[PDB]
Amino acid sequence: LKRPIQRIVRLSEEENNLIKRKIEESFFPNFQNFALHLLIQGEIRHVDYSELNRLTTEIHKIGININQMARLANQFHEISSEDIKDLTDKVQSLNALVQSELNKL
Amino acid sequence: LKRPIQRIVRLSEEENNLIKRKIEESFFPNFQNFALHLLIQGEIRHVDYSELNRLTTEIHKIGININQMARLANQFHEISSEDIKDLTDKVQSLNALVQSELNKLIKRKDQ
């Protein structure tokens, strides 16, 4: 025999009905030929979001500044109106760093 | 019995050896889980959202710190109640951007 190896795929009733539609929408007449082609041609794709790593790292160091401001405000229980608008500026600068490093992509 | 239907695929030894190498290259343990996904979806895509969640988690942390600050600032009459508002708006205006603009990225990656 040309193909003596037999592999089984087990299916639910709905999964089987999906398979039937895919066969009909395919170029192939029957399951054997549909499945053979797709198992051989289907290529696994790996996808990650490492292109954001540069942006994540620049946000992070803004983070550590805002973080130490917060630790200090909490240990001295004081905050000034100058600290508030200074925060606001750091916030609108994060808004800039985000649109910028994301258009770059 | 969750899966009471079986379909059979016949292979040559060389086609079967090719499929084994593919199953090893995927995140699926065995032929069942590999075929089921590939025959119904038509592709296998392993997506790692790790770096994207590291981004949104950092933005979340900054938001916590800012809220701690704004809240405290309510204890001081010299700090305008409507200048704390102007800091809290710009944090939600940044969350908005981060979320939408990152969905535009997840679409340009699911293609």
Numbering used by the authors:
A (entry chain C): 7 to 111
B (entry chain A): 7 to 117
Cite, word for word, the article reporting this structure.
The tetracycline-resistance plasmid pCF10 from E. faecalis is a member of the highly transmissible pheromone-responsive family of mobile genetic elements (MGEs) found in enterococci. PcfF binds to double stranded DNA (dsDNA) and is specific for inverted repeat sequences located within pCF10’s origin of transfer (oriT) sequence. PcfF-oriT complexes, however, recruit PcfG to form the relaxosome, as evidenced by supershifting of PcfF-oriT complexes in the presence of PcfG to higher molecular mass complexes in electrophoretic mobility shift assay (EMSA) experiments. Here, we have solved the structure of the accessory factor PcfF, which binds the pCF10 oriT sequence and recruits the PcfG relaxase for relaxosome assembly.
Crystals belonged to space group P21 and contained 4 molecules in the asymmetric unit. The structure was refined at a resolution of 1.9 Å. PcfF crystallized as a tetramer (dimer of dimers in a head to toe organization). However, the tetrameric interface is weak and deemed unstable by PISA calculations. The biologically relevant oligomer was suggested to be dimeric, in agreement with results from the SEC and GEMMA experiments. PcfF contains a RHH domain at the N terminus and a 2-helix bundle, here termed the stalk domain, at the C terminus. These two domains are connected by a hinge region. In the dimer, the RHH and stalk domains are built up by secondary structure elements from both monomers in the dimer. In agreement with findings from other RHH accessory factors, we determined that PcfF binds pCF10’s oriT sequence via its RHH-domain, and that mutation of the surface-exposed charged residues R13 and R16, as well as I14, in the β-sheet strongly abrogate oriT binding in vitro. We gained evidence that this patch mediates binding of PcfF to PcfG by showing that a single point mutation (I70S) abolishes PcfF-PcfG binding.
